[PDB]
């Protein structure tokens, strides 16, 4: 099940000069394009093998458009600064996101477009992609401005067409990377606390995509309430990691088994510590 997202962050820096603007695009958990106003040559550039091939017209348009986004959001930073009656010496952050999700069949299941100001939700396009939701009174101003401009149509047009269309294009160019799931290499570790207990840690390494289910069972049953679970983390090579732990009394290890569920596994494997 695939999706494509574009995110951006405009961070004002009074004194430091003009606002920094960075943007990037992803297909699933893979970044394929990046832009940074700070670069000696601000331009959208490839980050995934399956898009490096796109012609020069592509990069010229991707770049030209994103620079325009930068200019617009910089203008937005001061406009919102006006709405909230804020100092001109304080730093502020305007974040943007847009994206489309495809179903199993590859059709547009849901679209999105949202703005957040200084960490909080500001303006969002609703699920219907035909209306907006303001988070507060300032956003109500932006909302009316969006309605009076009938821009929703322009955004959903993008979400229903280009977004889905190009998502398919990328999914094919990188069929090997994007439509392939690497199963997690897994094992359990033992961590003795003197002689009265120990922690059993279950590892899932080098897998992709990131979605995964790790749980501990005692005599077949989820100890889900006493299980330690770390946020899934990037290994740095494109794959991910995750572990789950559970403190148990010495001499009760075998009563515990780790359940691992991943897209790249024929069937959820079951693990147990080996003495």
């Amino acid at each position: 099940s695939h999706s494509m997202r574009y995110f951006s962050a405009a961070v004002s820096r009074p004194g430091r000069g003009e606002p920094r603007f960075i943007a990037m695009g992803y297909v699933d958990d893979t970044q394929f394009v990046r832009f940074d106003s700070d670069s000696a040559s601000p331009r959208m550039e490839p980050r995934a093998p399956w898009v490096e091939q796109e012609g020069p017209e592509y990069w010229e348009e991707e770049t030209r458009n994103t620079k325009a986004h930068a200019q617009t959001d910089r203008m937005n930073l001061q406009t919102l600064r006006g709405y909230y009656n804020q100092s001109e010496a304080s730093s502020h952050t305007l974040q943007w996101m847009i994206g489309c999700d495809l179903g199993s069949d590859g059709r547009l299941l849901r679209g999105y477009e949202q703005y957040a100001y200084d960490g909080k939700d500001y303006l969002a396009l609703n699920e219907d992609l035909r209306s907006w939701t303001a988070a507060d009174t300032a956003a109500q101003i932006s909302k009316r401005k969006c309605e009076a401009a009938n821009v929703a149509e322009q955004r959903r047009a993008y979400l229903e067409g280009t977004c889905v269309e190009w998502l398919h294009r990328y999914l094919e160019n990188g069929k090997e990377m994007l439509q392939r799931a690497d199963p997690p290499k897994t094992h359990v570790t033992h961590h003795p606390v003197f002689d009265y207990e120990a922690t059993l840690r279950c590892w899932a390494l080098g897998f992709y995509p990131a979605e995964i289910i790790l749980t501990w069972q005692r005599d077949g049953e989820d100890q889900t309430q006493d299980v330690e679970l770390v946020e899934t983390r990037p290994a740095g090579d494109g794959t991910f990691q995750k572990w789950a732990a559970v403190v148990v009394p010495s001499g009760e290890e075998q009563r515990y088994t780790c359940h691992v569920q991943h897209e790249g596994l024929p069937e959820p494997l079951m693990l147990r510590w080996k003495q």
């Binding site: 943007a23 458009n65 919102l80 401005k145």
Partner: peptide, 9 residues
């Protein structure tokens, strides 16, 4: 392919 413009808030 990225949408052409950002909304003028």
């Amino acid at each position: 392919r990225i949408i052409p413009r950002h909304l003028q808030l």
